[PDB]
Design a protein around this ligand. Structure first.
Ligand SMILES: [K+]
Ligand SMILES: [K+]
Ligand SMILES: [K+]
Ligand SMILES: [K+]
Ligand SMILES: [Mg+2]
Ligand SMILES: [Mg+2]
Ligand SMILES: [Mg+2]
Ligand SMILES: [Mg+2]
Ligand SMILES: [Mg+2]
Ligand SMILES: [Mg+2]
Ligand SMILES: [Mg+2]
Ligand SMILES: [Mg+2]
Ligand SMILES: [Mg+2]
Ligand SMILES: [Mg+2]
Ligand SMILES: [Mg+2]
Ligand SMILES: [Mg+2]
Ligand SMILES: [Mg+2]
Ligand SMILES: [Mg+2]
Ligand SMILES: [Mg+2]
Ligand SMILES: [Mg+2]
Ligand SMILES: [Mg+2]
Ligand SMILES: [Mg+2]
Ligand SMILES: [Mg+2]
Ligand SMILES: [Mg+2]
Ligand SMILES: [Zn+2]
Ligand SMILES: [Zn+2]
Lengths: 97, 212, 97, 25, 127, 202, 91
RNA sequence: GGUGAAAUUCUUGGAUUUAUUGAAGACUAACUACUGCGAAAGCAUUUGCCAAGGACGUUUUCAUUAAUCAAGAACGAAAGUUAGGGGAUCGAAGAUGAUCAGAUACCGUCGUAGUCUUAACCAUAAACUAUGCCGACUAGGGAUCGGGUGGUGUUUUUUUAAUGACCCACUCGGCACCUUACGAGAAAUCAAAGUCUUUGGGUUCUGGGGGGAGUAUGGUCGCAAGGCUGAAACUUAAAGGAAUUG
RNA sequence: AAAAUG
């Protein structure tokens, strides 16, 4: 039967969506279907913010951040637990945690 | 059995006549020899230093500046403007979802001879009372804004030399002029001249270089 | 456009088609405007320009060739030059330049 | 077997049949 | 009051490069890697190997005359990972406490404008 | 006769004597009779005009290009062929160009070329379809046709001659240092077999 | 009546030289024997002389062109890029 | 370097790494969305030109010109074919390193055709919403895209105003969504898959247990690969759909 | 990392 009411993707009124490559295994997946996660991680968290601040030549440096949009295919996202198998009723919940 | 740092000498990078600070740091090169001139090994080096370090103010922490060595003058490498680029962290922080990213780029010649490509970026923004959550432009606003920015950049270049273009870039007056000329199209929060790329240099003009 | 005015002139006004009748109308001074196709030979175009200068007749340069000018004047044959003798109820003689 | 590979095997066999029928006359 | 170099930590997976250069980058000072500091062929990217490489690099930088470093850290970039390897942060911390002063940390990972189709095929690496 | 490309008879005035000088150019595609051809340093960038290589911008398509200034045309003369201006070096004035063979050549910036592509292109796309048509093609070029295979000869006639089967017998790739009578086959071949992949290595 | 199903102009060659070669030759023979529009007098009276020569029966003007077409795509592209370079150089 | 671990491989002829350049082809990140356009396939850098299109607005125009459609046409992803150009990347085949019991598989390194383009062929996809098209009606709700109307509206300056952006209210058209389903359905689920034994708005196509079989044959299209059309003998009590508990 | 058959 049909598992997901719309589909396992987000494509209504389109027909075709250009694919992206999974960051983990490089599988081709349509962009609307791929699981997309943003990473805003500090350039140095590393249990090392204070060490880099002390070593810094600038007072109040405000070290920058790395921004990375990760695209995961379904299999890789499930395996790496970015996304988990949910119950039939819990699947109908698009709110992030 | 070399230890090549015994045959190396240090030189001081004197970047500007205009930035705020002549001293940016030091660079090392092999001592001049018979068939290998240290002045020839230098004079093509590009150093990328932060505009915050060039100006003394952390309000220029983005906008890295490229400085190309033109002459070696008695243990002093006199450089000149070679290009400007935003930092990757600043660019990524500015680029956000639920808004329109507008980019323009022009290839313009400075008043004397310098060919440059200017890349300006801007982002649509919500109004103070806006309830809508994305504030997208209608791509005709985007075309008009791009045309306005292209005209602004092409007239801000072609009316100044490279030195005056750098002195205009430092206070970011071009961003304010773009904001003033586009505020009647779309709010356009994060206006920036994100990059200047040097494409073709004039004849050397050591006299023009000798302003520092 | 030029085509609607030309069609109106053909429908209501008076005209001559072709180089010989155009030159005759120019020399008798009953030509109000001459339309010269883009592909007219340059010597003939220069002679028409000289005739129109002598007769104080306006010259409009049709962007199409003789085929296009014939189509614009509504004929199934090539027309290298048109001469407007009377505009009829058409504003071609004033809606130029 | 898989339907796709069954169709592929059938196509290969059809090519063989066409070839033998062509060789005959 | 300090002599500035550039750290140039290339933290890929399978390796970490700690490559201190001059301000220009043409002249290099004490490029040391994790594979130089471990002999196991699988811990080349390890944080311990990166820390050892950064400590050696900073020692040679202080012996040469480099006191501070502007930090430029990159992943493989291009189309391969885009994520810094496990050794980059460890190398940066080792440089931070090896007496070197730190300035202007930046991520310089090469990012395309959707060029150069990624390796692996359309079904990707199947493990 | 013997040329794929048509020729243009361009008549100029003699600047030093009252007379006409007819010149035989290789017609570029688009050149017509009654057209004015302009030749010189100050001639405009128009098809059929003869311009120095330095006076044309990057990407210009020229033909009948001089190898040295004044040689009156050496390169890109066969039908459909052309030279691409790919760069200039004003100091030590030179022009970098792409030849029809794909080679990159540095030529003096004073060397002249004809703007456009040599007329008669696409000629070799039509199969000759007939030994008679090949016969008539080479009847007005030279006695190089038909060609007997050396493997079909006797040993006295060719290195490939002889044997109880028609076969080469030794490697047909012949050294550049071979002498006359030995250079039959693939002279100084860097490689053999079907070309697979991309050519023009770096 | 349509006299041949597919060979057309190449029916002169009978069954010789192969179907693929006959089609390749047919395309270019049709191209080379077609009448073309004159860009000077506006008539469809341009026919090939020898290869690369295209003469209008009316107005007697002859132009250099392709071996089997009045204008090859390469020559059209060359004309367009030459116009572009000339306009850029003049402005 | 690569991997889970390795090895193939490159490397003191200086590999990898760093800087400065140049060339080539491809692609168009981030912005990018339960967002837009298109008949569908599809379409994402700027600018110019060329024609085209929906919706909206209309106290314009014609006046039934329409809906759906055997036959017939146009387009039709990818792969593949032909012939030029191009050939950076990845990469059917192929070669190799490993793993293995074997591993001409997964994994690693290369690498031909291909990938790109022009001129033509091919006409097929889980070409999918597995839901023909046109029309009417039957719940509740909030968003959003395009157009329009209004406001004692907010913000922006040009000198009155004004558009621009935003807010509020409505409206037409659209991609959708949420709740509940009176109703439907075997159920999953469905605002259509409802208005069906209280069975008829119009119309096109298709199916009739599972195999044999989309096979054989014939025809037709195609350069070929193949496309379209398409049985029978024989065999069989199940195959299948949805859901439940293990 | 490997894990086939009843
Ligand atoms: K490793
Ligand atoms: K022979
Ligand atoms: K022999
Ligand atoms: K290739
Ligand atoms: Mg299932
Ligand atoms: Mg599809
Ligand atoms: Mg798996
Ligand atoms: Mg396995
Ligand atoms: Mg031969
Ligand atoms: Mg014999
Ligand atoms: Mg012999
Ligand atoms: Mg021999
Ligand atoms: Mg014999
Ligand atoms: Mg290694
Ligand atoms: Mg949009
Ligand atoms: Mg983009
Ligand atoms: Mg039909
Ligand atoms: Mg295709
Ligand atoms: Mg490869
Ligand atoms: Mg089908
Ligand atoms: Mg179907
Ligand atoms: Mg049945
Ligand atoms: Mg079931
Ligand atoms: Mg059993
Ligand atoms: Zn994956
Ligand atoms: Zn003519």
């Amino acid at each position: 039967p049909k598992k997901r009411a719309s589909n396992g993707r987000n494509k209504k009124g389109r027909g075709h969506v250009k694919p992206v490559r999974c960051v983990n295994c490089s599988k081709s997946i349509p962009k609307d279907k791929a699981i997309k996660r943003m990473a805003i991680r500090n350039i140095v968290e590393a249990a090392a913010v204070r060490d880099l601040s002390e070593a810094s030549v600038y007072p109040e440096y405000a070290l920058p951040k790395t921004y990375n949009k990760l695209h995961y295919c379904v299999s890789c996202a499930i395996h790496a637990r970015i996304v988990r198998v949910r119950s039939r009723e819990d699947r109908k919940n698009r709110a992030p945690p | 059995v070399v230890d090549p740092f015994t045959r190396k000498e240090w030189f001081d990078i004197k970047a500007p006549s205009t930035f705020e600070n002549r001293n940016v740091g030091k660079t090392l090169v092999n001592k001049s020899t018979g068939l290998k001139s240290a002045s020839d090994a230098l004079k093509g080096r590009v150093v990328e230093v932060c505009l915050a370090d060039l100006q003394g103010s952390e309000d220029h922490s983005f906008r890295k500046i490229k400085l190309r060595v033109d002459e070696v003058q008695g243990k002093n490498l006199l450089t000149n403007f070679h290009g400007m680029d935003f930092t990757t962290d600043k660019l990524r922080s500015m680029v956000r979802k639920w808004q329109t990213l507008i980019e323009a780029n022009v290839t313009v010649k400075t008043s004397d001879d310098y060919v440059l490509r200017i890349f300006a970026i801007a982002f649509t923004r919500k109004q103070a009372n806006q309830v809508k959550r994305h504030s997208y432009a209608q791509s005709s606003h985007i075309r008009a804004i791009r045309k306005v920015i292209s005209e602004i950049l092409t007239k801000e270049v072609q009316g100044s030399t490279l030195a005056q273009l750098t002195s205009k870039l430092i206070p970011e007056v071009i961003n304010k002029e773009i904001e003033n000329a586009t505020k009647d199209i779309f709010p356009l929060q994060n206006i920036h001249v994100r990059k200047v790329k040097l494409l073709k240099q004039p004849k050397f003009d050591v006299g023009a270089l000798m302003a520092l | 456009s030029i085509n609607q005015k030309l069609a109106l002139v053909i429908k209501s006004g008076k005209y001559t088609l072709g180089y010989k009748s155009t030159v005759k109308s120019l020399r008798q001074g009953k030509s109000k405007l001459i339309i010269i196709a883009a592909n007219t030979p340059v010597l003939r175009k220069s002679e028409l320009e000289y005739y129109a200068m002598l007769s104080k007749t306006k010259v409009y340069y049709f962007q199409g060739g003789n085929n296009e000018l014939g189509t614009a004047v509504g004929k199934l044959f090539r027309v290298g030059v048109v001469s407007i003798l009377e505009a009829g109820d058409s504003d071609i003689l004033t809606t130029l330049a | 077997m898989r339907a796709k590979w069954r169709k592929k095997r059938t196509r290969r066999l059809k090519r063989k049949r066409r070839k033998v029928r062509a060789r005959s006359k | 009051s300090q002599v500035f170099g550039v750290a140039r930590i290339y933290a890929s997976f399978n390796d970490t490069f700690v490559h201190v250069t001059d301000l220009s980058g043409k002249e290099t000072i004490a490029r040391v890697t994790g594979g130089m500091k471990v002999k196991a062929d699988r811990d080349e990217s390890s944080p311990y190997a990166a820390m050892l490489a950064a400590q050696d690099v900073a020692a040679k930088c202080k012996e040469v005359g480099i006191t501070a470093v502007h930090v430029k850290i990159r992943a493989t970039g291009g189309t391969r990972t885009k994520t810094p390897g496990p050794g980059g942060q460890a190398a940066l911390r080792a440089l931070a406490r090896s007496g070197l002063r730190i300035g202007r940390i930046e991520d310089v990972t090469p990012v395309p404008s959707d060029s150069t189709r990624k390796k692996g095929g359309r079904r990707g690496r199947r493990l | 006769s013997g040329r794929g490309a048509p020729l243009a008879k361009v008549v100029f005035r003699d600047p030093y004597k009252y007379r006409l000088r007819e010149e035989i150019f290789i017609a570029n595609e688009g050149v017509h009779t009654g057209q004015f051809i302009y030749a010189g340093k100050k001639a405009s960038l128009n098809v059929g005009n003869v311009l120095p290589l330095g006076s044309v911008p990057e990407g210009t398509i020229v033909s009948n290009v001089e190898e040295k200034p004044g040689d009156r045309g050496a390169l890109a003369r066969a039908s459909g062929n052309y030279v691409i201006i790919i760069g200039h070096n004003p100091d030590e004035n030179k022009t970098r160009v792409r030849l029809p063979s794909g080679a990159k050549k540095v030529i003096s910036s004073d060397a002249r070329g004809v703007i456009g592509v040599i007329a008669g292109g696409g000629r070799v796309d039509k199969p000759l379809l007939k030994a008679g048509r090949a016969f008539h093609k080479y009847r007005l070029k030279r006695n190089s046709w038909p060609k007997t295979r050396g493997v079909a000869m006797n040993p006295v006639d060719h290195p490939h001659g002889g044997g109880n089967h028609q076969h080469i017998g030794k490697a047909s790739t012949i050294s550049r240092g071979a002498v006359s009578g030995q250079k039959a086959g693939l002279i100084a071949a860097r490689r053999t077999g079907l070309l697979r992949g991309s050519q023009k290595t770096q | 009546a349509k006299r041949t199903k597919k060979v057309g102009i190449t029916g002169k060659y009978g069954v010789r030289y192969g179907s693929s070669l006959r089609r390749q030759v047919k395309k270019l023979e049709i191209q080379q024997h077609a009448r073309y529009d004159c860009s000077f007098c506006g008539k469809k009276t341009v026919k090939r002389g020898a290869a690369g020569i295209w003469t209008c029966s009316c107005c007697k003007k002859t132009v250099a062109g392709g071996a089997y077409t009045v204008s090859t795509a390469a020559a059209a592209t060359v004309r367009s890029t030459i116009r572009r370079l000339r306009e850029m150089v003049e402005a």
